[PDB]
Design a binder for this molecule. Structure first.
Ligand SMILES: *[C@@H]1O[C@H](CO)[C@@H](O[C@@H]2O[C@H](CO)[C@@H](O)[C@H](O)[C@H]2NC(C)=O)[C@H](O)[C@H]1NC(C)=O
Ligand SMILES: *[C@@H]1O[C@H](CO)[C@@H](O[C@@H]2O[C@H](CO)[C@@H](O)[C@H](O)[C@H]2NC(C)=O)[C@H](O)[C@H]1NC(C)=O
Ligand SMILES: *[C@@H]1O[C@H](CO)[C@@H](O[C@@H]2O[C@H](CO)[C@@H](O)[C@H](O)[C@H]2NC(C)=O)[C@H](O)[C@H]1NC(C)=O
Ligand SMILES: *[C@@H]1O[C@H](CO)[C@@H](O)[C@H](O)[C@H]1NC(C)=O
Ligand SMILES: *[C@@H]1O[C@H](CO)[C@@H](O)[C@H](O)[C@H]1NC(C)=O
Ligand SMILES: *[C@@H]1O[C@H](CO)[C@@H](O)[C@H](O)[C@H]1NC(C)=O
Lengths: 613, 613, 613
């Protein structure tokens, strides 16, 4: 016998359509993930023209459509970005429609050419759509994707919410945020020039000559062999080249491009080299419903669907950077995705009144003393209070957990042979509540502000004013939530070399009050948001106006998981039996299912006991 | 043995006609959906000329018809749009005939070139109709489409109207609004130029020379190899090129176009590359009748047909944008489909008298307190009333539902072994009526208007004046129906930076009274409708005259479902049996169909009980 | 074994004649419908020259006839239209011979070029008739068409006239109005130029040079490769091109045309590419006679033949638009089929005396109150009467039906187990007679006319003065027959912006009396008929003289059904048996054909009872 795709290939002798829907899709990075739907090849289906083997649950639409532009299209801002290969799945109506595709390599290469070079972008393309490939609505889930939903399903039964939240975020690492429901199979040949923005500013009649020049250069590049056999029609073609900044040529599908392959010959190689030039989709929790999971109860597949909808929404929030996006404004935030709407600030210097953190031991007394290495007082008062010109603002209040360890051993001998030694090692969890506060200038008349620095570093982050996990010259750190150390000096002479303008803290629950004269958790205005660490799903951010914090390169996406699996109380024993003599036999029955077994002089049984919560 | 299409292909050795009717059709987006009719290949039927295998229920009409235009056609407005590939199914006589095709990529690309560039559109085409492919009227439904009508059918039996309405809208997501009953199989080669609208304004004798120039350029482009071997007959050909804005060339079916393929050679590749160049159809509820569903009762397939007719009609209503469509008017509404008939306004500034919302608890007392986080008072009075110069207008009155949770546990031991612990967790639904009102200037003499802002954001929407779910600088939100937060400030100095001209609210049941001096639910005039959230099938809209709300890009269609499945009252139990000893056996018979089973020391039975309504 | 066409193809190895008679034919749209006669291939018949397999009941006539015109033919009016592919079936002697073909795409493309461009039409063609293919008069009906006549036949037995009328109109949707009895198989190559009408007005000797120029251009276009190798004989050829408006070239059958295929080479591709270039036929009710239906009684196939003759005649009436057809007259009715004979009006302004509607409840008292939401009084009198200067005119009197609903439940318990609950839901039909009247100025001396508007909108129509289902600024609607809302204002200052000249109402039974000084139901003269809704087979029309109502595009045909199936009184029960205990068995015998069955704890029997009339 013979099964699968290869049974179809031997009977028909024709290839398989390589552009298939039903896979996962990361909609921030525009990459495709593991396979969510099930692909079966039982019925040996082909396309209606009889040239590709397709799966059973997939129907194709023949729309053998070719498009050719004699023009270009001008994109003078990176905010209204066109993806050119995943356009329909990014333009969906949602909360985070402005963040889709903003970590793609095709976007981040385009943004760094319009800012570095002060440029505008043109695009000419020859698109060749051959098939639309869709999924039948009566399709079932994949074997691997169903298994990982059932593992989330088990944790919701046992009331294990923190461990289900962890596994829901690993589903988004492996399967993305969306499922592709239709793909467009075809090829495309794309030109992408970058021109100086001064070259477009002439008129609205110059625009229709810039645009038809780029389409003329594209047809020369395909036809004329890199040589200067070009049909350069004007001086405007020659003036186009001198303002041109970058000029990439990209082939997507088909045969590889080289300058000189005619448009006829590129279109002969499209056959059997087809890629997805467009995609449509639905979010990942749409397909977690009682129809797809018929072997689970009704309200229990709605807990799985809600804990994955929360994990996808958490992934968009941690990759959102509001800031000033206008490159001509003086406070331009490079490394910012969303237009903050605050492009003109007032440059108000503020007073940093210091931080302090309370602690409250909940369990595990006289063993760890959690409320000693987790407690910080304000250097301006030496107390858990702000000074006279200040007022406290509550940042965040969570529970910290650490583990401590007992080790007990006793030895017993029986009939002067057969020494028994048991060694028990209990691991328990000690908890503590902390409440971190923060001081704000609310009296409007200080003499001196105090503590002139506002830069941070975590146990996993780096202070950018040192490029290390250290303080600058003459700075002492102040401990915060679990791992933050805020560098602080009140010297006013040796501290003013490294002192940055500080803007305020805010988190997912509280806002800073330095914007309104509750709060807004935006920014003061003119400053730039920068993230501190994440305290178990909540993000703490701080504002600053250096310019050193802003620039650099574009960061990659923060990938899940954003939490860690929690600590559990444990126990481990070690029983050793030592026979101190020959002429001493021993029989051991290890459990009720074992049989009687002749014993050995050294036994060494082991056991590890874990309790969840 | 061998079945299906491949039995036909082995005996006949000729391809299958790839252009088939009986599929679903979204008539707003002009895309085709899942298959509604059944395609069988039992009888090995071919076309009468013997070159394509066709299904059994489908007859073809040979009309081997070629059309060639020596002219063009001028389309100087996007209102009277010709689809060129789905023209006959969009031009049907209905209520929403002006909205068909208005979310297609071919329309939205054409509209954004006549507005951005102030252009007119010409089209030249060579169409090659080969077959008309129709359905026999005695055809039956598909296997997948019948299953999803039977699932709607089950919910109408059990008096589950909200869950049947939900499943009827997923039928429209998967199968569209129409069923194609005839397709035209063939190929087409289309030219589409955009010319400046000043170029056509000369006379009615210039029109017949603009038009015959575009047909001359199209024949040069197919014949002459991209080179300037053109037979440019006049200076009017040269003046045509300088007013030309875009110029796309599109091939639909056949071999891919390249400039230089002769018209002879393009017509040799039409064989075996045929697409649908035209379609006809009927609405989706036409095929839900007692003839197609013979295994269901008569009045029950009329409930299924009526609940799908309502879901299709709801889909056209939520994608209708009335507004000013004349691009020369100063209050031009980009992102508008339907001509509002109000292109000249009067610019009347109005008074925003504030909003307030009542609540009335219906069930679930002393558990949730729904009437506390769902209650809003008017800031101008501190009361559930409008001020002295105002009058209340009732927007909408619906029922809100939330869930609350009990957890009861008791433990029982029997004969000092066999500890039993049952943990019951009941989920109930608490309901509340809310009535949202709205104030209108009805006394005509205010001193100051009050509360100068009118922008909104939902739990799934974004305030465009912040590009976030937040208020602007110095604004406090007012809670409304379930998730609306209307940003409001009465400062008159720090609020006038962000204050927009407000026009009024209206919904599917009430109209605003700011048009007549019941109501009209149109607009005031000069303002632009913009949608707020959807409160369970009803759409709330608000009017504004910024210009920031209007422009941007064209939005995609709002796809179904527009409601959510309702909440149900639940129960979950957990019985645990713990044997505290060996020398203690146990036998368990789980149900009346099980056999007696030897018990284990830990059992952990589980149960989940759901009641619908 | 092997049956059908493929047995003939394997033994003979030659194609099947693809041009066959016996199909249905829509004579308004010139499209062909489902197959009415039966096509069998039992006897392996071929044509007498032995090149096509033909069915058994079909004889062919070899008339291998080629026609070539050296001239053209001039068609300076769209009234005397020549179809060029279905000419013999449109020119039949009947009442509606002037409406045949007037919704074809070939007509509606020609009419919109003689009106938009003020043009005349020329046509040159090379026709190649090969076979005449006819039906033997002893042929029987198809399997699908006989089944749908037997379903109409069943409804006439049971005295179900409204449901038979509905099914007779679905026969015309699926099978057209005619049956083709002979087709002409061949090919044709057609030229169709449009010339300005000023170019023909020189003399009757210029006509014979315009005509021979178009035939010379057609022979150049086939022979000379799109190049200017033309044998342009005169300056009259050059002057012909400058007055030319459109110039399409159409190939029907054969190989596809391209400019440059010689007339020799086009005629070599006619073999095996044959289409119907002409058709003859008979109406659809001709073939409903006791000979075609031998298994039904004599007078009962005359009821089927009469109810289909009425449905075809109703289809021509609803697609007839009388109006002014002369394009030079100032009151030109675009969107008009039939010459009204009233091309010069007098412009008489009339007085709109308002509408009022009576109601009379017939059955269903104290349940629906049909005579409350179906009653309208005249705003000029506040009464069911016209004012002093007016007189009432009765439009239409029909019966309205709505449904109401009872729901009764009672519960019964037996021996403290076995709870029985039956839930009965009766649906009844409430009827009401309405009589709609209309006021006419019959006293000739009014002071002011009153109620200055005359535009309508239905529940399925749109007011063109709003492009929506709404009133204009300052207008209140008046309810009419079932869904008409006539917009009305008597303000004379804010109403005169939207006030249209009103002409009168008329229906299929009454005429307006505004033409004679019974009635004529034509028009007043100068006005234009426009249809309101259809009240169960009767059409209500209204007259107006805007010019906004007239122009636009040509509408498609109104397709059947024009009625809906009527309401029926229903009943639905739900009996539930609940066993409240174990140790309680139950046996159930569901009917007299079932066997005894062991019962379940929850049963839930269901029943739906319908009575026709
Ligand atoms: C960038 O484009 C500008 C046009 O905006 C070019 O400036 C023109 O160059 C031509 C060529 O010598 C001159 O005749 C014009 O006087 C220049 N100015 C204007 C306003 O047209 C400029 O040369 C381009 N940059 C480079 C480096 O060539
Ligand atoms: C757009 O079209 C207009 C015609 O309406 C062009 O204007 C004419 O151009 C010719 C060529 O030089 C002149 O001889 C005429 O005097 C111009 N005016 C008129 C009223 O004909 C115009 O040139 C075109 N636009 C561009 C950018 O070329
Ligand atoms: C449309 O046809 C008329 C003929 O009726 C053309 O008018 C003649 O054109 C020639 C060519 O220059 C002149 O010699 C004649 O004097 C014109 N008049 C007459 C009465 O013959 C007219 O030119 C054509 N239209 C166009 C746009 O060319
Ligand atoms: C699940 O465990 C948490 C832990 O505190 C508790 O608050 C909650 O009530 C538990 N729920 C159930 C249903 O056991
Ligand atoms: C269906 O349930 C709704 C819920 O209130 C009720 O109003 C209606 O009467 C019920 N109808 C039937 C037939 O049970
Ligand atoms: C058929 O039913 C109609 C309904 O009123 C009645 O008028 C007519 O007399 C009936 N005819 C026969 C033959 O029963």
């Amino acid at each position: 016998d013979e099964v699968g795709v290869q049974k179809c290939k031997n009977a028909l002798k024709l290839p398989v359509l390589e552009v298939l829907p039903g896979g996962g899709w990361d909609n921030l990075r525009n990459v495709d993930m593991g396979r969510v739907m099930e692909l079966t090849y039982s019925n040996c289906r082909t396309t209606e023209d009889g040239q590709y083997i397709i799966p059973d649950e997939i129907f194709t639409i023949p729309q053998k459509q070719s498009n050719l532009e004699m023009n270009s299209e001008i994109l003078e801002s990176w905010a209204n970005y066109q993806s050119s290969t995943s356009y329909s799945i990014n333009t969906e109506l949602s909360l985070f429609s402005k963040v889709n595709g903003k970590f793609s390599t095709e976007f981040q290469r385009m943004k760094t050419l319009q800012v570095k070079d002060q440029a505008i972008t043109t695009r000419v393309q020859v698109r060749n759509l051959v098939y639309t490939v869709k999924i039948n609505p009566t399709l079932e889930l994949s074997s691997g994707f169903r298994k990982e939903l059932l593992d989330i399903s088990d944790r919701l039964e046992n009331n294990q919410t923190r461990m289900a939240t962890y596994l829901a975020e690993l589903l988004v690492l492996n399967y993305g945020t969306h499922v592709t429901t239709s793909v467009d199979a075809g090829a495309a040949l794309i030109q992408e020039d970058h021109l100086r923005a001064s070259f477009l500013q002439d008129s609205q009649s110059s625009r229709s000559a810039v645009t038809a020049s780029a389409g003329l250069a594209f047809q020369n590049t395909v036809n004329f062999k890199f040589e200067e056999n070009y049909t350069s029609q004007n001086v405007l073609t020659k003036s186009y080249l001198s303002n041109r900044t970058n000029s990439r040529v990209q082939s997507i599908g088909g045969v590889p491009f080289y300058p000189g392959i005619t448009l006829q010959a590129w279109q002969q190689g499209i056959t059997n080299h087809l890629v997805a030039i467009d995609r449509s989709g639905l979010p990942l929790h749409f397909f977690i419903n009682p129809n797809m999971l018929p072997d689970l109860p009704g309200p229990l597949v709605k807990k799985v669907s809600k804990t994955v909808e929360t994990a996808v929404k958490r992934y968009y929030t941690f990759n959102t950077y509001p800031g000033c996006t206008d490159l001509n404004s003086p406070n331009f935030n490079f490394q910012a995705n969303t237009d903050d709407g605050s492009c003109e600030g007032k440059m108000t210097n503020f007073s940093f009144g210091g931080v302090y953190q309370e602690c409250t031991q909940l369990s595990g007394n006289r063993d760890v003393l959690l409320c000693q290495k987790l407690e910080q007082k304000n250097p301006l008062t030496g107390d858990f209070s702000c000074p006279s010109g200040y007022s406290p603002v509550h940042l965040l209040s969570q529970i910290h957990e650490e583990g401590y360890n007992h080790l007990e051993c006793h030895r017993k001998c029986t009939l002067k042979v057969f020494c028994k030694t048991v060694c028990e090692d209990v691991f328990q969890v000690a908890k503590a509540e902390f409440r971190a506060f923060w001081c704000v200038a609310s009296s409007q008349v200080p003499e001196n502000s105090g503590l002139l620095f506002g830069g941070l570093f975590s146990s996993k982050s780096i202070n950018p004013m040192t490029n290390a996990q250290s303080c600058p010259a003459g700075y002492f750190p102040l401990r915060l939530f679990e791992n933050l150390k805020v560098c602080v000096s009140q010297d006013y002479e040796l501290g003013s070399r490294f002192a940055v303008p500080f803007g305020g803290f805010f988190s997912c629950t509280v806002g800073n009050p330095l914007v309104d004269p509750p709060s807004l958790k935006k920014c003061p205005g003119g400053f730039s948001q920068h993230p501190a660490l994440i305290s178990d799903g909540c993000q703490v951010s701080y504002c600053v106006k250096s310019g050193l914090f802003t620039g650099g390169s574009l960061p990659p996406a923060r990938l899940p998981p954003f939490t860690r699996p929690p600590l559990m109380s444990q126990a481990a024993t070690n029983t050793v039996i030592v026979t101190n003599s020959e002429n001493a036999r021993s029989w051991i029955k290890d459990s009720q299912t074992h049989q009687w077994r002749l014993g050995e002089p050294i036994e060494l049984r082991r056991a590890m006991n874990v309790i969840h919560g």
